[PDB]
């Protein structure tokens, strides 16, 4: 199982947000900690992506692009998984030092978004998603959002995405075709469900960046740049998710 071996081997470890849990909750402290967590996880997503089979055959500008567009979805999906495995989706396990209960979901001013993320987490339970299905699905999320005008070398991206879909299908293949078919259907629907969540978070973080000075929310270096240059391309429709099913 060469492909699964690799994904297992390269999977990032635990990342802490640096949140002070000894202090009372506030919108500013929670969001500043989430922002710092995003920066920390981005460092890990880059190291991971570089190690994915075939990633480096992409044009370097395209490597940059897929990372810059896909991080929100990737990170939401991984957080959904952590939440499922660590706390049976009861709370949102952003990091060991940043676990959102309902009060934090309210104080963060992201309650509705948190609801959807917890629903995603529950799906891993409801669908009985395996660790190996999770790994293949997460890898595929890196290749699920691109410019409508295409990438620099679209053909190499298309080939890579194709191969990650095939690896997912293999990990699903059940000597009964109907079982594998229903399963692939379910998992592709679940992958699609990440995108509207990521989009709502894109809008929220962009709006927050625009007003960050007014609410005492800190955005680290890479996050601020990505959210001001790359995220607006998503929000303006220049960059769109790749859906399996018609929305």
């Amino acid at each position: 199982p060469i492909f699964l071996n690799v994904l297992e081997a390269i999977e990032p470890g635990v990342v802490c947000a640096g949140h002070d849990n000894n202090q009372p909750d506030s919108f500013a402290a929670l969001l500043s900690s989430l922002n710092e967590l995003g920066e920390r996880q981005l460092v890990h997503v880059v190291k991971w992506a570089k190690a994915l089979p075939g990633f480096r055959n992409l044009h370097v500008d395209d490597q940059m692009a897929v990372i810059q567009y896909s991080w929100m979805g990737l990170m939401v999906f991984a957080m959904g998984w952590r939440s499922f495995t660590n706390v049976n989706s009861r709370m949102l396990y952003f990091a060991p030092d940043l676990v959102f209960n309902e009060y934090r979901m309210h104080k963060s001013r992201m309650y509705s978004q948190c609801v959807r993320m917890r629903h995603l987490s529950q799906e891993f339970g409801w669908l009985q998603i395996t660790p190996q299905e999770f790994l293949c699905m997460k890898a595929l999320l890196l290749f699920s959002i691109i410019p409508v005008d295409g990438l620099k070398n679209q053909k190499f991206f298309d080939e890579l995405r194709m191969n990650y879909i095939k690896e997912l299908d293999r990990i699903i293949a059940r000597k009964n075709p109907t079982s594998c078919s229903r399963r692939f259907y379910q998992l592709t629907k679940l992958l699609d469900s990440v995108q509207p969540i990521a989009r709502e978070l894109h809008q929220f973080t962009f709006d927050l960046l625009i007003k960050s000075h007014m609410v005492s929310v800190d955005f680290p270096e890479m996050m601020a740049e990505i959210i001001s240059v790359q995220v607006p391309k998503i929000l303006s429709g220049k960059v769109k998710p790749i859906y399996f099913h018609t929305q």
């Binding site: 880059v46 940059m64 890479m222 740049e225 990505i226």
Partner: peptide, 13 residues
């Protein structure tokens, strides 16, 4: 051109 991100992509470390 995100310099910090490109640096992370370019560095081996």
């Amino acid at each position: 051109e995100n310099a910090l991100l490109r640096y992370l992509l370019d560095k081996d470390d």
